Amino acid sequence: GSMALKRIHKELNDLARDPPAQSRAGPVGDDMFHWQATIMGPNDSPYQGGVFFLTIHFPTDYPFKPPKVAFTTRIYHPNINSNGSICLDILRSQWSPALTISKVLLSISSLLSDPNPDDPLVPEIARIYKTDREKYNRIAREWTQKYAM
Amino acid sequence: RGLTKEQIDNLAMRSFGENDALKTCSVCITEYTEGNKLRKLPCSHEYHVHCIDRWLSENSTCPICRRAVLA
Ligand SMILES: [Zn+2]
Ligand SMILES: [Zn+2]
16 A cells, blocks of 8 residues: 555645635544545535544555545435445445545535535435425534434 | 456557647546546546546446436
């Protein structure tokens, strides 16, 4: 993972010099292939006021394979399940070696602001998001208060 | 599904010159220097030869615009 390590250091230095507005990320300890990330809940969302933790594990052949990104903070969202898995195409079939962690974080923030109920990782929450939007907003606020604050 | 060595070798290659405008390879996020070998796709996006060839050994699309490299 020599080439992977150089790109990971490059991304870490770029994040440190130009921090993205609502997200931060960096290695937990001395393992450069394992990062923690924190994302602030978007202001236009029921997740407002919450801080959401994520793990990022880079494969040894990064960036030619996508990083494994998962929430560790529980969250009520049709595209994020109880294992923290994120239904985001760029983390799966649409991964590209031109993508970066900062772009992944921005895309996750947009997913928090605008869920996709038509790609339901959690069908029950997508069902509620489609049929009862205020109920989704109430529960998402409740979970943010309980788990993300 | 990736491309064969023959299909990859059919794509245009150039050496970064002393007078060339500076660009950065999107795969390794490293700026080109004189002597670097660059490979350009039919969509006109270009990369380090070693960077894009490794991607195209298991994939068939441009990392930037996601167009298919082959016809
Ligand atoms: Zn490169
Ligand atoms: Zn292209």
